[PDB]
Amino acid sequence: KIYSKHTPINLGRDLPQGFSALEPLVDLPIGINITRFQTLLALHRSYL
Amino acid sequence: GTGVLTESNKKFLPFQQFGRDIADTTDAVRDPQTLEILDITPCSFGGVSV
Numbered sequence: 001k002i003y004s005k006h007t008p009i010n011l012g013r014d015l016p017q018g019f020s021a022l023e024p025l026v027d028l029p030i031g032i033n034i035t036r037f038q039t040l041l042a043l044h045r046s047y048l
Numbered sequence: 049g050t051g052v053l054t055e056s057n058k059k060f061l062p063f064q065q066f067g068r069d070i071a072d073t074t075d076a077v078r079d080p081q082t083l084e085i086l087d088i089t090p091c092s093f094g095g096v097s098v
């Protein structure tokens with residue numbers, strides 16, 4: 001289950017105060033064992 | 049269920065299907081065939097006194 005939210009935060013503390021609930025985005029029927037995770041970043045080639 | 053299906057003004061979110069009151073009883077339904085919200089109200093009933 002993936003839940004998400006996009007909130008426009010006025011310039012300040014990155015983790016703001018107040019509430020912004022995350023709406024359910026997708027439920028995927030996967031059925032696998034998950035104990036570890038990693039974030040994917042994008043890198044651009046230099047060409048120099 | 050047995051009830052009257054009426055038009056509703058409740059702004060359901062896209063994931064949301066069912067609707068519930070303070071009693072956690074079904075108060076609205078979203079139909080799969082036509083994506084509209086039908087408010088469910090129990091039919092009229094009462095006690096008869098002679």
Ligand SMILES: *[C@@H]1O[C@H](CO)[C@@H](O)[C@H](O)[C@H]1NC(C)=O
Pocket residue numbers: 080081082
């Ligand atoms: C049939 O059902 C789907 C979802 O259950 C809906 O998106 C579609 O509009 C329905 N077909 C018609 C002709 O309304």
